[PDB]
Design a binder for these strands. Structure first.
Length: 170
DNA sequence: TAAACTGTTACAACCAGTTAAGGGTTGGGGGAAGCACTGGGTCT
């Protein structure tokens, strides 16, 4: 995600812990998605880097219980503001917790979850920032405000979405 | 010259009737969501 002059790239590599197999290897190969250039108009609502990261992680995959062995993720980021490249994040949890939240949200449905997230990103930008503030610096009430903007966005707000959110709440 | 004896301490009905317990009108507008500073390679 690049904004005019600044350019951000976040690579999150997957590593094993005990053992893997070719099924796991090919599953990780299938995890590779989100082709380089997907920018036609979405940037008009992407604005914040975290929001764009969440939107792009929406189209990614979040299933790892298939391989019979669970995985771990290490994420590193690179920035380029004014043609200056360096590292500002080598081991940060926000990708991991965002990925876990996405996995636990869309487990109860993918069609309604996709519709909800897409609608809030498109028109309920306040709700999108509210959700990212509920994930970044985790505070549960922010989720509610996002859902509030959902009614401002005409979101269907299916039964299973709030159930998945409550399961995330624990 | 004596200093209240006694039945009696209310009965009975009844102990809110109805009507509605918000009507409406609006549920963040609107801007921004890092500005630089720190450049990594490959060559001479």
């Amino acid at each position: 995600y690049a904004k005019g002059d600044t350019t951000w790239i976040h690579i999150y590599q997957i590593a094993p812990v005990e053992e893997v197999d070719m099924i796991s290897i090919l599953s990780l190969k299938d995890l590779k998605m989100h082709l380089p250039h997907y920018y036609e108009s979405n940037l008009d609502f992407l604005i914040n880097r975290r929001l764009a990261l969440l939107y792009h992680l929406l189209h990614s995959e979040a299933l790892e219980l298939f391989t019979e062995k669970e995985f771990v993720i290490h994420s590193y980021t690179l920035e380029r503001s004014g043609n200056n490249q360096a590292i500002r994040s080598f081991e940060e949890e926000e990708i991991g917790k965002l990925m876990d939240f996405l996995w636990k949200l869309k487990r109860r449905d993918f069609y309604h979850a996709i519709k909800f997230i897409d609608d809030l990103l498109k028109k309920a930008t306040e709700g999108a920032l509210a959700l990212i503030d509920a994930i970044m610096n985790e505070r549960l009430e922010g989720f509610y405000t996002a859902l509030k903007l959902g009614k401002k966005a005409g979101v269907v707000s299916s039964r299973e979405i709030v159930a998945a959110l409550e399961d995330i709440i624990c």
